Ligand binder design. Structure first.
Ligand SMILES: [K+]
Ligand SMILES: [Mg+2]
Ligand SMILES: [Mg+2]
Ligand SMILES: [Mg+2]
Ligand SMILES: [Mg+2]
Ligand SMILES: [Mg+2]
Ligand SMILES: [Mg+2]
Ligand SMILES: [Mg+2]
Ligand SMILES: [Mg+2]
Ligand SMILES: [Mg+2]
Ligand SMILES: [Mg+2]
Ligand SMILES: [Mg+2]
Ligand SMILES: [Mg+2]
Ligand SMILES: [Mg+2]
Ligand SMILES: [Mg+2]
Ligand SMILES: [Mg+2]
Ligand code: NA
Ligand code: NA
Ligand code: NA
Ligand SMILES: [Zn+2]
Lengths: 123, 203, 66, 103, 80, 118, 50
RNA sequence: CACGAGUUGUUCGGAAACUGAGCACAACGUUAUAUCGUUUUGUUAGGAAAGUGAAGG
RNA sequence: AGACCUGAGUGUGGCAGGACUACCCGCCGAACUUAAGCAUAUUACUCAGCGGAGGAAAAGAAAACAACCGUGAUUCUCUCAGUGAGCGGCGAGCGAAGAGGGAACGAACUCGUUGCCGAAUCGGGUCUUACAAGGCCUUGAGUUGUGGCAC
RNA sequence: AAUUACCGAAUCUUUGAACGCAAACGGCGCAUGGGAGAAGCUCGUGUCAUCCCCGUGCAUGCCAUAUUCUCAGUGUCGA
RNA sequence: UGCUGUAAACUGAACCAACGGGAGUUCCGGAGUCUUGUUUCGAGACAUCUGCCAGAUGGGGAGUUUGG
């Protein structure tokens, strides 16, 4: 049984060795599952599977964070693989951005600066 | 400017020189495809007044349609029911050829936005219109405040819903007042207004 | 020199132009079909020459109508 | 009433020709430069019978005018043609059974 | 005759399973599905049978991705 | 461009730039020391399997249904340090794939079975 | 007979696996409603036909 | 009816890899509408549909 | 050699095809039924068929009403009105608009043309924390006209 | 915590508009990057041909573009 | 007026330049040059042609009726 806090403080190589050890142990437990086997031994199958899942989660999260940090640079930001870009929605991706809209012509800017909306009260 | 000379010249379609030019162009056009892409419009003044600019997102195509009336598509020319619905050759379509041309181009090329069109040439078999379309994914288009209204998705297939000038013409929205009361905002809208049965609460 | 259809037309319609050169192979010919008649209605000397590509090479562009 | 049979036959559904065993269209040579300005000589290779037709068909071999190749044609045989015969086509041809000449 | 005896004369198969909709409606000789119109790009849909439309419409299956995109929309696409 | 010797024109030969290799669109970590555990699942303990172990130097395994004989041999060697001289496979009527693996005479299937824990 | 596609073989294998009775402790669970399988199939009554 | 088992291939049948009666993707045309038509009598398409032998330096 | 015009091939960056379709926009479009028969008429500019969007859609800023002491973009509600309008084998039947009381309302703007300027414009590289409405550089596009200012 | 609830980080088999080519086939490719290979080769290693496994790209149409890519035309010119 | 052959009347072969000339390796001739341009042939402003109007004919087909 592996603890997530201890897992997060390890390198890739140690994580891979632990992954191999746990896979080997589960493969051994399947043999017991086939040839009779006692309840105390069969009760170990679930914790091992969840430990494997934990190790794989840590590995993949580290990999994704590193790759995003790599492609953060403006030189390579235009070649980011589409699996690392923000998903949102098809239509939101295709819609006009706030900067793209909200532009006006020179005449409209000048008129809005000459005649702004006022605050007033009536007595 | 030069616009006045081009306009006054194109208002003389029956003169000898204009007839010669149109005859050469018609011969040339009828040996091409049904849809053709152009680099520049054939009538720059008309295109500009209809909304085309010499920019990076505007394109021009030329589309062809067949002249004449409509034949009812019934097997062997046989109809059934009341005799008043028995014509096969004398009926006419309720939509004009300019709108049909715009719809054909729009159905074929789905990544563009159809803006307007104008009459270019005519024949005994064919009619030719030129269609203005813009690309909604171009940065120039998206940043120009005078055309970037067309990037919104409520303008996706205007020609299929009849929101172009030719569609408005055959819908009847060239008139107001007492000549258009039964067709505003649409025939179906007027029908619903005039025909739904109303139940007030405390009637 | 004055280049461009609009500017050249304005110079012809005033009396500023002293000579006008017109290319003979413009693609929609309606852009310049009327130009000799206008230069003749005024008293502006004009000539029609062989290539809009050669005119454009002269002025530094790809082509030129007049 | 219902459709008449002579009108049903115009769809050509089960009324088309049975042509699996046929050998192809029978036609003369192509009218080309050699035939217009001289003559060409061919040799009759075989005489055969094609299903559905009452006349014989002859296979005639020529030489390709432009490439190193042999060209085989299929014509309708006149009466008297035999295998190994020489056939002339074109302007300068003599008058004999099987020769093709202008009218 | 045409009753009991001629039911033994029925050998073979007109339809097999469809690759797109899973029904036994694929016509072997025409290579076309009588239920979903495969391999046409769009599916069969007729307003004279609303019962069939309601049998086939969205929400009669798993909503594998809609389940999560609806949650994202309801939570305003929040991110750390 | 000068002289044509054929009666019809055909598109000329031009320069074609080859396609570049993109950055990969996969981000998952995959381990090279793990695949054999997927290839081979577990053994069988029926009477036919025991008879084969005792008589023909053969072991019986349930394997991945999409694997092939070459992969099964490689996985056998990696997981247990033995050499397989023959693999015969069948897909069962319940959907699983079963393999009969015969070891070389230099290896005792009974010893390997004892090591496995059969 | 001998010939069948692998996809058809896998569908038949799934049906064979499904054709089983209910385990006995299911009936001892709390709030249980299931007594028989009620989706049992017999080769002689109803045909799958694929 | 319940439980437990059983189908082993370099060469056997298929595919890999033929053509037939035939089908219809592309291209083009037509239609308010493609969910229509042509598509082997050597044979697409107003029609620019061939992507690699030998090479040498 | 070269240039321009009109067309191809490949590389690089993008987009469309499907689903849903209650309401909404465009086309196509019946018959049963009523007329105590039936053909014009009615059912109905409806059902079925083919296309296309949204959170609403469509409409919208006078080539509009009126005939007054004059109103003033669009949409919707009551009423005008089952109408001393009108259409109709003038039969069965069908059938609106202006005005008036209201809901909403910071509601208005943009091209083309005319006149005066004439690359001041766009794309691409690069630098400022920055894929700036910024600077520097670029023939690439563009003078067969991008952009600015006004009666 | 094998408790529950919620959500921002992930995983996500074969298909399907389905799009490398096909399809009552868990089939067959081209380019490119890897892996395993007591064949052989070499000094238990290292290396590895044929065979085998895995990742990525490769549909048609349309738009933009090429530090200015490669071309075609008895189209108009000009060396 | 574009030109090199009628053995055949009982079935031969034929390509991927020899050679000549020029300023090692290219270029000319062999293999005539030219183009107010059309692939060639036939018709031709008729029509085997396009669309729109008009008149005849028309149980091939549709709807409906066939008093008391
Ligand atoms: K088709
Ligand atoms: Mg609008
Ligand atoms: Mg109203
Ligand atoms: Mg039978
Ligand atoms: Mg086998
Ligand atoms: Mg039983
Ligand atoms: Mg759609
Ligand atoms: Mg009713
Ligand atoms: Mg009645
Ligand atoms: Mg009655
Ligand atoms: Mg009746
Ligand atoms: Mg409907
Ligand atoms: Mg709107
Ligand atoms: Mg302007
Ligand atoms: Mg596929
Ligand atoms: Mg009758
Ligand atoms: Na079967
Ligand atoms: Na065939
Ligand atoms: Na009515
Ligand atoms: Zn189906």
């Amino acid at each position: 049984h592996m603890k997530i806090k201890d897992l997060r403080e390890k390198s890739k190589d140690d994580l891979l060795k632990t992954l191999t050890e746990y896979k080997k142990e589960l493969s051994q437990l399947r043999v017991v599952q086939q040839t009779g086997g006692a309840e105390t031994r069969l009760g170990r199958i679930r914790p091992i599977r969840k430990s494997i899942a934990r190790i794989l989660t840590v590995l993949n999260q580290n990999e994704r964070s590193n790759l995003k940090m790599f492609y953060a640079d403006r030189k390579l930001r235009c070649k980011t693989p589409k699996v690392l870009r923000t998903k949102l929605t098809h239509r939101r991706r295709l819609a006009l951005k706030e900067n793209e809209k909200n532009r006006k012509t020179s005449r409209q800017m000048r008129q809005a600066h000459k005649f702004p909306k006022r605050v007033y009260a009536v007595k | 400017g030069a616009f006045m000379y081009l306009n006054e010249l194109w208002k003389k379609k029956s003169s000898d020189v204009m007839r010669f030019i149109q005859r050469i162009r018609s011969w040339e056009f009828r040996h091409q495809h049904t849809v053709v892409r152009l680099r520049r419009p054939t009538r720059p003044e008309k295109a500009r007044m209809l909304g085309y600019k010499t920019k990076q997102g505007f394109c021009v195509f030329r589309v062809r349609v067949r002249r004449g009336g409509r034949k009812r598509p019934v097997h062997k020319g046989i109809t059934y029911g009341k005799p008043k619905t028995s014509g096969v050759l004398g009926m006419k379509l309720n939509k004009n050829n300019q709108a049909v041309a715009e719809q054909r181009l729009g159905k074929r090329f789905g990544n563009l936005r159809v803006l307007n069109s104008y009459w270019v040439n005519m024949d005994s078999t064919f009619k030719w219109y030129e269609v203005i379309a813009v690309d909604p994914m171009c940065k120039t288009i998206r940043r120009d405040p005078r055309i970037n209204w067309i990037v919104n998705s409520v303008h996706k297939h205007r020609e299929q819903r009849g929101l172009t000038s030719a569609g408005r013409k055959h819908r009847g929205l060239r008139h107001k007042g007492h000549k258009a009361s039964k067709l505003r905002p649409s025939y179906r809208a007027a029908w619903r207004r005039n025909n739904r049965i109303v139940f007030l609460r405390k009637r | 020199v004055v280049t461009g259809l609009q500017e050249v037309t304005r110079a012809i319609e005033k009396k500023q132009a002293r000579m006008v050169v017109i290319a003979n192979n413009v693609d929609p010919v309606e852009l310049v079909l009327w130009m000799p008649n206008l230069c003749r209605a005024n008293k502006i000397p004009y000539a029609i020459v062989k290539d809009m590509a050669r005119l454009g090479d002269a002025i530094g562009r790809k082509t030129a109508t007049c | 009433g219902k459709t008449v049979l002579s009108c049903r036959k115009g769809n050509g559904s089960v009324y088309q020709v049975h042509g699996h065993k046929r050998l192809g269209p029978a036609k003369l040579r192509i009218l080309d430069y050699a035939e217009r300005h001289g003559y060409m000589r061919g040799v009759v290779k075989s005489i055969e019978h094609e299903a559905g037709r009452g006349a014989a068909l002859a296979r005639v071999e020529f030489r390709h005018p432009y490439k190193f190749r042999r060209v085989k044609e299929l014509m309708v045989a006149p009466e008297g043609m035999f295998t190994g015969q020489s056939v002339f086509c074109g302007q300068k041809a003599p008058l004999a059974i099987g020769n093709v000449l202008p009218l | 005759t045409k009753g009991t005896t001629s039911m033994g004369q029925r050998h073979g198969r007109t339809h097999i399973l469809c690759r797109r909709c899973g029904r036994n409606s694929y016509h072997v000789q025409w290579e076309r599905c009588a239920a979903c119109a495969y391999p046409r790009a769009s599916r069969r849909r007729y307003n004279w049978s609303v019962k069939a439309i309601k049998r086939r419409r969205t929400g009669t299956g798993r909503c594998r991705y809609l389940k999560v995109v609806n949650r994202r929309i309801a939570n305003h696409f929040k991110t750390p | 461009r000068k002289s044509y010797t054929r009666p019809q024109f055909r598109r000329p030969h031009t320069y074609r730039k080859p396609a570049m290799a993109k950055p990969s669109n996969r981000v998952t970590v995959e381990s090279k020391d793990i695949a054999a555990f997927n290839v081979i699942r577990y053994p069988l303990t029926t009477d036919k399997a025991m008879k084969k172990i005792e008589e023909n130097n053969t072991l019986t395994f349930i394997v991945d249904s999409r694997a092939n004989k070459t992969e099964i041999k490689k996985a056998m060697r990696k997981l247990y340090q033995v050499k397989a001289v023959k693999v015969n496979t069948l897909i069962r009527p319940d959907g699983l794939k079963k393999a009969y693996i015969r070891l070389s005479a230099a290896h005792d299937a009974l010893d390997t079975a004892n090591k496995i824990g059969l | 007979g001998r010939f069948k596609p692998l996809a058809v073989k896998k569908k038949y294998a799934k049906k064979m696996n499904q054709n089983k009775p209910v385990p006995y402790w299911i009936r001892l669970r709390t709030g249980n409603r299931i007594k028989w399988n009620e989706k049992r199939r017999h080769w002689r009554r109803t045909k799958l036909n694929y």
